[PDB]
From TrEMBL, chain B:
Name by which UniProt lists this protein: Corrinoid adenosyltransferase
Domain Cobalamin adenosyltransferase-like, first and last residues per copy: 1-139
Enzyme class (EC, first level): transferase
Enzyme Commission numbers on file: 2.5.1.17
Binding partners and assembly: Homotrimer.
Length: 162, 151, 162
C-alpha cells in the first residue's frame, strides 16, 4: 500500500502550486498575503515530514503544531471581513492571481482526502489533517480578497443565491 | 470516497478552467471566453449532481460542446499528426484543462461502477477533453503560433 | 471498442497530465536565455508520449517493441549533473518557487512524482517497461535541477526553508 507516500506527495504538490500562486501577486499590494503564503510553504514542508513518519518517537516529535491552524483561522476571519459579503456562489477565477489561489484551494482538498484515508489506515499527526482542512478555507478567502484589491469582480454563478 | 473524489476533481478542473480564462485576450477570444464561463457553471452543476446520493446537468450541455467542437475543428488546421500539449501559454493552459478533465472522467467512470450517476456528467467530461483540445488548437491558430508536433 | 476502464486505456494516459504541465513550463522560458532547457523540455514531451505507448503494452504476451530506451534516462542524468554544476551550492532545503518559470518547473517535479506513483500501481496489472519507471523517477530530479538553474539565470534566489 502507498497511501502514506501519496499523502506526502500531494502535500508537496500543493506546496508547488502555492509557489506558483505567490509569483502572481504584486509585492506591494499583497505583502501580507505573500508573507503568509511563504509561511504556509514552510508549514507544508513540515506537514510532509510529519506524514512520512511511520511512528512518532521520543527524539523526533511532530513539527506541525496547533498554532499553525490557529493562525489560518485568524486570517480567514480577517479576509472574510475585508471582502464584500458573499451573495452568490463563487466560480473559481477572476484575476490570474485569484485563479491560481483557487487551484491551491482544490489541491488542498485533494491533499486532505489522502490524509483522511491515511488516518483510517494508521497514525497521523492530527494537526496535519486540521491544517489541510483549514487551508482550503484560507485559499478561498484570500482569493476573494485578491480580486477585491485588484478591483475585479469575483466570478459568480449567475442568479444563484447562497 | 469515490464520490467525494469525483466531485472534488470536477471542482479542481473548474479551477484550472478559471486559470485558462485569464490567459485569453478578451477581444481575440470573446467566443471561447464566454464558452469557458458557461462551462464553469456546468461543472458546478455536474459537481452537485455527483454529490447526490432532479439532476441539473442535461443533454443540451453535451450537444453544445459537440457543436462548438465541430466549429473549431473546421477553423483549425487539418490535423494529421500527433500534437503535444502547449504552444502559446494560453493553449498550454487549455491542454492542462484537457488532461485534468480526463482525470475527472476516470473517477466518474469508477463511480459509475460503484453506484448510480447522472450519465450526462460522464458524457460531458468526455466531450470536454475533445473541446479543450480543439480550442487549444484554435488559440494557437488565432495567435499565429505553431502547435507542438510529436514528429 | 475497449471498456471505459480498460487498464490499457488508463495506462496509455498516465503521463499526459505531466506532459501538459511541461507544456505550460516551456512557455515561461525565453529562448534567448533557455534554448538548452527549452529544447530538452520538448524532447521530454516526445519521450513522455512514447512512455504512454509502452505503458499501454502491459498486457502484451509477445515481445514488446518498446519506444522508451535507456539512453533517455542516461540523458537526464547527464543534464542533471550539468545543472547541479551550474546552480549555486545547495545547502538548505528548497521550497518550490522563486521565479514564475521556476515555480512551473517545481509543479512538473511534483506531477512527475505523481505519475511515478501511478506507474508503480500499474505494476499490479501487468509488466511495465522498467525504463519508464526509471525515467519518471529521474524526471523529478531533472525538474528540480532545472528549476534552480532557471532562478539562477534570472538572478533570483531560490526560496529556502528557514
Amino acid at each position: 500500500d502507498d497511501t502514506r507516500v501519496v499523502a506526502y506527495g500531494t502535500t508537496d504538490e500543493l506546496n508547488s502550486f502555492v509557489g506558483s500562486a505567490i509569483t502572481q501577486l504584486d509585492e506591494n499590494t499583497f505583502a501580507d498575503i505573500r508573507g503568509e503564503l511563504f509561511k504556509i510553504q514552510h508549514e507544508l514542508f513540515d506537514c510532509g515530514g510529519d506524514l512520512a513518519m511511520l511512528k512518532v518517537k521520543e527524539d523526533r516529535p511532530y513539527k506541525a503544531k496547533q498554532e499553525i491552524v490557529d493562525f489560518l483561522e485568524q486570517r480567514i476571519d480577517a479576509y472574510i471581513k475585508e471582502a464584500p459579503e458573499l451573495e452568490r456562489f463563487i466560480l473559481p477565477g477572476g484575476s490570474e492571481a485569484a485563479a491560481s489561489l483557487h487551484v491551491c484551494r482544490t489541491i488542498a482538498r485533494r491533499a486532505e482526502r489522502y490524509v483522511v484515508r491515511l488516518q483510517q489506515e494508521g497514525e497521523i499527526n492530527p494537526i496535519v489533517l486540521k491544517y489541510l482542512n483549514r487551508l482550503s478555507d484560507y485559499f478561498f478567502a484570500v482569493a476573494r480578497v485578491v480580486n477585491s484589491r485588484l478591483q475585479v469582480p469575483d466570478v459568480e454563478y449567475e442568479r444563484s443565491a447562497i
